[PDB]
Amino acid sequence: GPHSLRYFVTAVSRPGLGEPRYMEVGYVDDTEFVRFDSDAENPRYEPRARWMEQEGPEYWERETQKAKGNEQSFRVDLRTLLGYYNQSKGGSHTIQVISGCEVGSDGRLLRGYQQYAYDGCDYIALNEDLKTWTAADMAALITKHKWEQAGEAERLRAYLEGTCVEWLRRYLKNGNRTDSPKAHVTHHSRPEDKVTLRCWALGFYPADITLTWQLNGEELIQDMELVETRPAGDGTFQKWASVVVPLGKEQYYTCHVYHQGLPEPLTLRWEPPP
């Protein structure tokens, strides 16, 4: 199926407290594989996926010096944006970028992209055509005009069609995992002709999962409570879904768990101890 290489960059000023903090984080198919964090005496690129130890010292040195140069560019940009928006030199501000390529299973580029934000709002984006920009406000129009006058789009297209695709192929080669959920139902009291049935999924990877409760062959959507899927902190994820049911009718409800690691969806009910 398709694959992607994306970098998520952050630059955050902290006036009067130090130099901006700069981070560059890389993802192959949405799994983090490298990170650079400027907050250090002699900051360096670090692997974040174990298979990255395959790259030799020259790789780490090159990526480190390039990140340091990127960091210094964003330090300038933070100052430039104060001028564009007529903002005080005293406040903290944040630039973020997501930049990368998505390729199909045939190795062709499906989409290259680069999106900037300033203080949490869209600022400028590269259009699908890889030739033009969409500015979000008047300040980003200044950037757009500058990048249009500088042949920036062609430089970026060369990166997205060339370097990005080529290294993505190398990383996929070097890095080529599911863990099925284990599920169970717990039982808890409610104002007390009612009981809460909570269906748990634990120990699964990747994070994508769907939990439903059924009564009389139909899914309960009204009043089903769900938590956002969350990290266990060991590389696996958790989720639960709960419903309030009448006391004594627990066996009329069924939890269904759907996940890519499973041969077929799980079906389960509350199992009162013997």
Binding site: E63, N70, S73, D77
Partner: peptide
């Protein structure tokens, strides 16, 4: 490999 960014 991350690109070299251009100043805004």
């Amino acid at each position: 490999r991350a690109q070299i960014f251009a100043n805004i």
